[PDB]
Ligand binder design. Structure first.
Ligand SMILES: [Ca+2]
Length: 123
């Protein structure tokens, strides 16, 4: 859920999870176009992961799962069901992806209407 997502990102990265609430073309609700930078690419991959999760009958925004932060690393506990395993994997992935990125203020609160119609395909 959003709680785990915020927590996992906060656990590994150098900045507040809120820094990615509205950034570039993909960090934030929905998203399309050309990912503006490394951070935006992390969000694109995360959007893709969440979509796969949603198609599997999971609820990315609220489905709770067990995890732990040890030495700034996300540990996904033994998953009970597939959805818990998938979501933790998704959040763990974006948290790791964002950890070594540089933040570009020009993309903070970037106007979504400037984002192109075509987006990169999901893996
Ligand atoms: Ca998004």
């Amino acid at each position: 859920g959003i709680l785990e997502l915020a927590g996992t990102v906060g656990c590994v990265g150098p900045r507040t999870p809120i820094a990615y609430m509205k950034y570039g073309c993909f960090c934030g609700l929905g998203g399309h176009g050309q990912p503006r930078d490394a951070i935006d690419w992390c969000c694109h991959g995360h959007d893709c992961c969440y979509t796969r999760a949603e198609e599997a009958g999971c609820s990315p925004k609220t489905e709770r799962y067990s995890w732990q932060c040890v030495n700034q690393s996300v540990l996904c506990g033994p998953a009970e069901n597939k959805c818990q395993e998938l979501l933790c994997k998704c959040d763990q992935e974006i948290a790791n992806c964002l950890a070594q990125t540089e933040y570009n203020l020009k993309y903070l609160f970037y106007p979504q209407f400037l984002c192109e119609p075509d987006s990169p395909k999901c893996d």
